[PDB]
């Protein structure tokens, strides 16, 4: 009804580019990338959009006077004239304005710190039907204005930049019960032993197996229930609605071809029903406009998977390679138990393939120069990479001395988890390949760009 603080919301601007609507969402990446862009959700039935890089959290909402006062030094309901602080639901970095250029428009991207007037945006109405002061309503169309740059959050012609010209911004509430499911989480496919995917050294891992032991603990067995709903996508998850199963460690959507094979095919190969799934109570409403009703507990759960395009039951047959396939009736083994993962396990998994996609653009991009001279490969990113190592050093920063002994042993424990979930996925082997490919020269190529060859190697 009305937005509050600690609410998950997305921003969204619309463009009619040659009689074709695009309701494209604002999305920033974080952890190596300091700039925002757009994400298409119009073709949500034929290409999946990302969700974890576009949902925001309204951290605070103050008046302008108190904000300048603090800068000189429950839940509120937002008012058309408050100034807000939006933080990324994944990266934990606040959305702000940047002093770069891509005119007099400034570029929009995340940043670490919150102090200064950069990270604050004053809401504004955009029609005669609303005016100043009153409470925000859900589904409104509004304006965002920076405090520091004194500009509007503009969509240009796809540079999203803080400009002096306006653009509407549809907002949409996402989330707001412990132990119950919430739309968009990552969790474990427990058996009674969990579902897995094969290890490294590549098949493109496209099979699906059940395994046992500590491999479920590691970063292979992670799956994200990306629900097709736009508004209130972070509701509770009930029986009957469809949801694509996304792999988290590699980003390949589970799409059943019961005609052909069980495939984790790639991004744009997800239709509506070829990859949808649902949960049945046995093995034989329509919509809730809210955060949902409390459906599925975690330990008290025996959940039965069923495809939408076929309608059969995935059950295993008679290493541990009991590869499960769709059966018409199955056995009494499709009562799958559930358990959610943690917030640092979700954090570690997402930063693996955000970098694995980047280092392969620096292995094969540097294997393009492994010939004599091609010189046409501009896909050898330097500023996109030499920034991305500084975050992964700071991600593995050992905790300082002067700290509380109940806080160090929290920081030292979460450090050892980050070192183990990088060990199994072969990140240690994946960097040593990159030290090989750069140890061919002695300080190269066109030596105007890659003059930072030593600092990348160092």
């Amino acid at each position: 009804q009305f937005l509050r603080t600690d609410d998950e919301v997305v921003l969204q601007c619309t463009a009619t580019i040659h009689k074709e609507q695009q309701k494209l969402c604002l999305a920033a990446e974080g952890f190596g990338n300091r700039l925002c862009f757009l994400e298409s959700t119009s073709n949500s039935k034929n290409v999946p959009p990302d969700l974890s890089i576009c949902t925001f959290v309204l951290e605070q909402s103050l008046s302008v006077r108190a904000l300048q006062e603090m800068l000189a030094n429950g839940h509120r309901t937002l008012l058309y004239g408050h100034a807000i602080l939006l933080r990324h639901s994944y990266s934990g970095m606040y959305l702000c304005c940047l002093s770069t250029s891509r005119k007099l428009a400034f570029d929009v991207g995340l940043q670490e710190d919150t102090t200064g007037e950069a990270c604050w945006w004053t809401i504004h109405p955009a029609s005669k039907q609303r005016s100043e002061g009153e409470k925000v309503r859900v589904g409104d169309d509004l304006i965002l204005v920076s405090v520091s740059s004194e500009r509007y959050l503009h969509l240009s012609y796809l540079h999203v930049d803080a400009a002096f010209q306006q653009t509407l911004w549809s907002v949409a509430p996402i989330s707001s019960a412990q132990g119950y499911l919430i739309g968009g989480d990552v969790l474990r496919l427990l058996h009674g032993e969990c579902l897995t995917v094969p290890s490294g050294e590549h098949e493109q891992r496209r099979t699906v197996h059940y395994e046992g032991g500590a491999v479920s603990v590691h970063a292979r067995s992670l799956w994200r229930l990306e629900t097709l709903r736009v508004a209130w996508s972070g509701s509770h998850i009930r029986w009957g609605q469809p949801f694509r199963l996304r792999h988290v460690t590699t980003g390949k959507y589970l799409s059943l071809m019961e005609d052909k094979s069980l495939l984790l095919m790639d991004k744009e190969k997800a239709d509506v029903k070829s990859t949808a799934f649902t949960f049945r109570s046995s093995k034989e409403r329509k919509e809730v406009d809210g955060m949902g009703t409390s459906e599925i507990k975690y330990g008290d759960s025996v959940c039965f998977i069923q495809h939408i395009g076929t309608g059969l039951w995935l059950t295993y047959q008679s290493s541990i390679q009991r590869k499960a396939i769709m059966h018409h009736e199955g056995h009494m083994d499709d009562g799958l138990n559930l358990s959610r993962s943690q917030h640092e396990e979700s954090r570690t998994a997402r930063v693996i393939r955000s970098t694995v996609f980047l280092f392969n653009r620096f292995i094969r991009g540097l294997d393009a120069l492994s010939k004599k001279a091609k010189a046409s490969t501009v896909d050898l990113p330097i500023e996109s990479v030499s920034l991305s190592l500084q975050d992964l050093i700071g991600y593995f920063h050992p905790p300082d001395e002067h700290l509380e002994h109940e806080d160090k042993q929290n920081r030292l424990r979460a450090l050892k988890n980050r070192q183990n979930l990088f060990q199994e996925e072969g990140m240690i082997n994946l960097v040593l390949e990159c030290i090989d490919r750069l140890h061919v020269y002695s300080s190269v190529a066109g030596r105007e760009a890659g003059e930072s060859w030593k600092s990348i190697l160092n």
């Binding site: 300048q68 007099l104 520091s148 004194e150």
Partner: peptide, 30 residues
């Protein structure tokens, strides 16, 4: 040493870059 009066000081130098060599020397020389 004031509040946000430096903000307009930046708008007059960043929306319009200086480029003043077209103005300061070439106009009064005939």
């Amino acid at each position: 040493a004031k509040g946000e009066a430096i903000r307009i000081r930046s708008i007059l130098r960043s929306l319009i870059p200086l480029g003043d060599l077209v103005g300061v020397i070439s106009i009064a020389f005939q």
